[PDB]
Design a protein around this nucleic acid. Structure first.
Ligand SMILES: Nc1nc2c(ncn2[C@@H]2O[C@H](COP(=O)(O)O[C@H]3[C@@H](O)[C@H](n4cnc5c(=O)[nH]c(N)nc54)O[C@@H]3COP(=O)(O)OP(=O)(O)OP(=O)(O)O)[C@@H](O)[C@H]2O)c(=O)[nH]1
Ligand code: 2HP
Length: 1095
DNA sequence: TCCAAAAGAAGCGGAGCTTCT
């Protein structure tokens, strides 16, 4: 252990003594880090990192010599070198700001003088950077090596951080803001998704800094310093970037939104470089110069990504061997640029792509304020995708003379729910714009005869891309629907694209031509279809047409169907047989396809089935209050308002209700996964208000074109036949808004009662500022909840089955109870350790625990089985990083601001997370994993979780393999996996040890409401063990069901489009039987199997 | 209670209580 000597030799002049027991100032940098056995950073040992790296960046020859490589990325040319020269000079400016900020900190309140006199200011939350200073006469100065290396990290972060951030949705913004998700003001989500929170910015910066410093953390040093020092440095660099205007800080006052929200929340936005900045073409020169093993880079040719050892953001969970094999397979796939699409995008240009695929130029006064904010977010996503694609294209273009010949590989990792995620925001898996420009799919096709199988494959790809629902009709019928479209409405766009694929020119009205031809079929993949068909038309050799056009083998109501197959536990029922067939499990129908099912047997998918059940439940609710005119009227008004604005709700002239599957799509999915009804009500209301705000811009558009337009024709002219007819749609609108905001349903003793809000809407509508908000939004939500969402939930349960609902409830309860215990025991062992440390004279409050101490606490929980194992996947439901364990500031900047909480990897309560973790994981996650690793695994695909893009040459075999992979996943038993973990947990848990908080948390899950109050430890223990029994019985039923199903003749077409179903070749023939007959025979086999078990 | 990543700021003082034009 000559590690102390080693690091002291590199940093001999840092203030203090590297001995935790020494009496004076102790140096916590040298106490916290060691030199690595093998070099990680080329700046370790450098007297002047900025000068050294700037010299390295100054020429190709110098770069190659610094990095010890033969050749540099060809994108690193003269123009890029000139930009890095200028960036390096800016690095000097950042360094200078930092030095001045230190000087100010040392001067203020005599901190420097006191520090020199022995005040341990280096251990304060704002003084941890004093661990990297050196005595300088009557003052102190930064160690230049550590300062300059940190600045290099700062520069790289500045270049590429924005592109690397997570996407914020409504739930994220709700957690951040503390505002109820259903009540988030319009445009707030966009505001927060465009910026980084303090924790987001500092943590990403701190990671980079620690990486570039290139040392290893001492396992026996307190986290207050190992995490604290790089975090303190990050905070200072963020502050310096704010001074330099590289970063804008915006402190958002929540009280202007919710007046009793006291939170003021910092948002940090990096100043964007010009889209045409040469540095965009190679933004990682610093990273690839400093680090021996760079993270940030593109992988060209045979440069392939390494395989990740651990689950994304879950370092306690190693990727299994099967998972690692899947990752290797996906990373091995070669992606290539499709030049025609790149040229098309380029020729249209950014402005016209925004006009076509976004919202175009916004006239902020033909626009409702709320609608305007939604349109800004639409533009932002498309624009960022476009810019990112072209930066990537510029880098590819440097690699060779023919950009279409340059292989590209992408890094992937497994997420906590077992999905293979392509790393990055703007890649083929995540970004539709990019997905049509960079593809692994490729085929050489004989399209000389429109009767070829090759031409049929080509047609299928075109049709699917053009929004023909290819899984709902046979290949033959598809062909005719496509032909009708190509020769009809799409013809003008095809002609335009033929001209483009001849001369390279587009007409001035290109956007209008595409818009009018496509209508609601418009998408990036639709643009690919127009491109590829027109290319075929002009092709000189149609017998060898080369195209990346693909067919997606795409899951049919995938999550719900997987849940039903994986977690239904009872005897077989005929309703279940009928409903599961809607997802492509066919019993007694050899070689049956989804296409045939939809066309000849049942045109109603699982969404339509639940929508139909909603119509029944709604009808019953209307009957239970038949005599109640106020209630009937309130329901009518809700339905009227929805009919006005949503395509999926239609009221006929005689009051006949038609609901389309579209309204049940998200509600169905999220309900199984443990979503409450209130959140669904919120989302349905948001869909309505979105449409209202959109219609208000339609009004402003009408008025400007025609000053003497009536308010009725302005708002309902596109929807009506006469002027007075538009007047009745307007009368409906104002009547509906008044009654739905001034009156709400409340459930009192099971019966719905109407209550006045006192906060009804009325007054002249100002279409520009019109906003539904606060108490008015709450009211619309309460109406939606009781008169629509509740019936829908009843319909959903009827459709997926009460048995599945029971399984998911037991799953939720078991995993929640386990997570509560894990969280509480981890916290107690931490608190017990802190009580010991307080007796240690070397320890100070704010120093936390060491990594060794934390690992020992993590290891101590292992007899509680925190991990779920399936044999090929590992799930850690409780795994989190949170600020609650340490409950303290980690570091601040030198102005006593940017106070970053100390976050710790620790178990936290699951809530309902167990349901989606296991359903997604053992369903689509296992499917894809299997597809990547099975015998004859399809090559050259793009997997997107529950769909896989396949090149036209291999659509048949790849689809059949996909259906086989579904079948393989259907041999899983997630409840059994949960049971095995929970049973071990039950063997080792002591409920008497839990805090009354944890004990209450468990009570809610394990006990009926009337029993929470004050039940005993032994009560909740006995209730928790009953859940173990429930799990065991469910797991047993599932096992039997899968075994029995596998004995029978099955045709599986869940990954549908192509009509290539997987046959299980089970030997019991259930053909020419009704579902009732089939249920009887399956239940006979079940009881047979149950008897073999008992005997 | 849907999931795939968390996540107030800042004066005084040197942690953690306090207050929030
Ligand atoms: N908890 C949960 N799960 C959700 C969900 N929406 C969907 N899921 C899960 O995915 C399957 C299949 O859904 P699908 O729409 O066919 O395919 C999606 C999906 O796999 C994934 N995805 C989008 N949003 C979410 C999400 O909010 N959560 C999760 N876990 N997954 C999501 O991405 C696929 C779409 O990829 P693509 O870029 O091609 O986009 P599309 O062309 O489909 O159009 P777009 O609007 O962008 O999606 C479900 O059965 C379920 O298990 C949800 O809200 N919550
Ligand atoms: O066109 P699809 O949605 O049936 O694959």
């Amino acid at each position: 252990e000559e590690l102390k000597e080693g690091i002291d030799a590199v940093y001999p002049s840092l203030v203090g003594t590297a001995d935790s027991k020494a009496e004076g100032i102790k140096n916590y940098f040298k106490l916290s880090f060691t030199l690595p056995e093998e070099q990680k950073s080329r700046t370790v040992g450098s007297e002047a990192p900025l000068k050294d790296v700037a010299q390295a960046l100054s020429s190709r020859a110098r770069y190659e010599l610094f990095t010890e490589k033969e050749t540099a990325n060809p994108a690193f040319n003269g123009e890029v070198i000139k930009r890095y020269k200028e960036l390096m000079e800016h690095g000097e400016g950042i360094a200078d700001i930092l030095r001045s900020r230190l000087a100010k900190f040392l001067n203020t309140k005599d901190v420097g003088k006191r520090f020199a006199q022995g005040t341990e200011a280096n251990r304060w939350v704002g003084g941890k950077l004093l661990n990297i200073v050196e005595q300088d006469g009557d003052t102190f100065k930064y160690n230049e090596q550590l300062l300059q290396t940190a600045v290099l990290a700062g520069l790289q972060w500045r270049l590429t951080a924005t592109s690397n951030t997570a996407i914020k949705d409504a739930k994220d913004v709700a957690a951040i803001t503390g505002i109820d998700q259903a009540l988030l003001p319009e445009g707030l989500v966009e505001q927060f998704d465009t910026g980084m929170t303090l924790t987001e910015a500092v943590s990403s910066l701190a990671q980079k800094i620690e990486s570039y410093w290139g040392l290893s953390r001492n396992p026996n040093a307190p986290l207050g310093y190992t995490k604290g020092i790089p975090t303190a440095m990050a905070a200072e660099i963020l502050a310096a970037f704010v001074e330099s205007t590289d970063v804008v800080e915006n402190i958002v006052d929540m009280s202007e939104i919710d007046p009793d929200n006291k939170k003021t929340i910092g948002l940090y936005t990096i100043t964007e470089l010009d889209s045409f900045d040469p540095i965009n073409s190679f933004p990682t020169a610093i990273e690839e110069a400093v680090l021996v093993n760079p993270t940030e880079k593109m992988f060209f040719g045979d440069d392939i990504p390494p395989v990740a050892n651990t689950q994304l953001r879950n370092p306690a969970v190693r990727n299994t061997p099967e998972q690692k094999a899947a990752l290797k397979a996906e990373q091995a796939t070669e992606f290539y640029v499709h030049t025609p699409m790149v040229q098309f995008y380029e020729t249209l240009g950014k402005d016209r792509i925004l006009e076509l695929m976004g919202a175009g130029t916004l006239n902020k006064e033909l626009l409702n304020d709320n609608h305007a904010k939604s349109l800004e977010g639409k533009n932002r996503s498309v624009e960022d995708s476009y810019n990112q694609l072209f930066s990537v294209i510029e880098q590819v273009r440097a690699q060779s003379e023919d950009i279409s010949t340059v292989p590209i590989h992408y890094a992937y990792n497994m997420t906590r729910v077992g999905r293979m995620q392509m790393l990055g925001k703007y890649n083929p898996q995540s970004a539709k714009l990019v997905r049509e420009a960079i593809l692994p799919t490729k085929a050489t096709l004989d399209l000389s005869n429109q009767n070829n199988e090759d031409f049929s494959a080509f047609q299928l790809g075109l049709a699917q891309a053009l929004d023909i629902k290819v899984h709902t009709m046979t290949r033959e019928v598809m062909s005719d629907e496509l032909t009708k479209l190509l020769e009809g409405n799409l013809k003008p766009a095809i002609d335009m694209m033929v001209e483009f694929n001849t001369t390279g020119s587009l007409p001035e009205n290109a956007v209008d031509v595409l818009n009018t031809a496509l209508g609601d079929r418009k998408s990036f993949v639709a643009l690919m279809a127009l491109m590829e068909y027109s290319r075929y038309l002009v092709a000189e050799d149609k017998s060898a047409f080369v195209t990346p056009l693909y067919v997606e083998a795409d899951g049919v109501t995938n999550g719900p169907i997987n849940a039903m197959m994986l977690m239904t536990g009872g005897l077989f029922t005929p309703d279940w047989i009928r409903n599961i067939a809607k997802g492509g499990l066919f019993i007694g129908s050899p070689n049956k396809t989804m296409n045939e099912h939809r066309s000849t047997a049942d045109n109603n998918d699982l969404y339509q089935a639940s929508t139909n059940a909603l119509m029944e439940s709604l009808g019953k609710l209307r009957s239970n209050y038949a005599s109640n005119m106020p209630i009937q009227s309130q329901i009518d008004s809700l339905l009227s308002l929805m009919d006005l604005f949503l395509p999926d709700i239609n009221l006929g002239e005689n009051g006949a209700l038609e609901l389309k599957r579209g309204i049940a799509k998200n509600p169905l999915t999220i309900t199984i996964y443990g979503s409450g009804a209130r959140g669904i009500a919120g989302k349905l209301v948001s869909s309505v208000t979105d449409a209202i705000y959109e219609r208000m811009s339609d009004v402003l558009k009408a008025r400007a074109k025609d000053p003497n337009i009536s308010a009725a024709m302005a708002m309902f002219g596109k929807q009506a036949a006469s002027e007075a007819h538009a007047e009745e749609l307007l009368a409906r609108f104002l009547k509906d808004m008044e009654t739905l905001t001034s009156t709400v349903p409340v459930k009192r003793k099971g019966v719905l009662e109407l209550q006045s809000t006192g906060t009804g809407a009325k007054g002249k509508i100002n279409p520009k500022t019109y906003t539904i908000k606060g108490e008015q939004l709450k009211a619309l939500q309460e109406n939606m909840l009781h008169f629509f969402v509740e019936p829908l939930r009843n319909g959903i349960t009827q459709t997926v089955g009460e048995s599945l609902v029971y399984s998911t409830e037991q799953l939720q309860k078991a995993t929640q109870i386990q997570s509560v215990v894990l969280e509480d025991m981890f916290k107690q062992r931490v608190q017990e350790k802190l009580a010991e440390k307080a007796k240690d004279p070397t320890w100070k409050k704010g120093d936390f625990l060491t990594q060794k101490e934390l690992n020992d606490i993590q290891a101590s929980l292992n007899n509680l089985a925190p991990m779920i194992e399936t044999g090929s996947q590992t799930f850690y439901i409780a795994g989190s990083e949170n600020a609650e364990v340490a409950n303290q500031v980690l570091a601040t900047n030198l102005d006593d601001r940017m106070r970053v909480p100390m976050s710790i990897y620790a178990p936290a309560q699951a809530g309902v997370a167990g349901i989606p973790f296991m359903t997604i994981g053992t369903g689509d996650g296992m499917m894809m994993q299997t597809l990547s690793t099975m015998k004859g695994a399809p090559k050259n695909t793009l997997k997107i979780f529950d769909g896989m893009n396949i090149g036209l040459n291999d659509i048949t075999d790849a689809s059949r393999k996909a259906n086989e992979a579904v079948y393989t996943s259907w041999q899983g038993n997630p409840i059994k996996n949960v049971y095995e973990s929970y049973a071990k947990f039950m063997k080792n848990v002591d409920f008497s040890k839990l805090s009354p908080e944890a004990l209450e948390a468990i009570g809610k899950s394990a006990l009926e409401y009337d029993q929470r109050e004050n039940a005993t430890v032994d009560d909740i223990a006995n209730a928790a063990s009953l859940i173990e029994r429930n799990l065991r019985n469910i797991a047993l039923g599932v096992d039997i069901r899968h075994k029995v199903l596998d004995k029978v003749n099955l045709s599986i077409d869940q990954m549908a489009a192509v009509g290539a179903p997987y046959q299980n070749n089970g030997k019991i023939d259930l053909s020419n039987m009704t579902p009732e007959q089939q249920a009887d025979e399956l239940n006979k086999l079940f009881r047979e199997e149950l008897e073999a078990r008992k005997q």
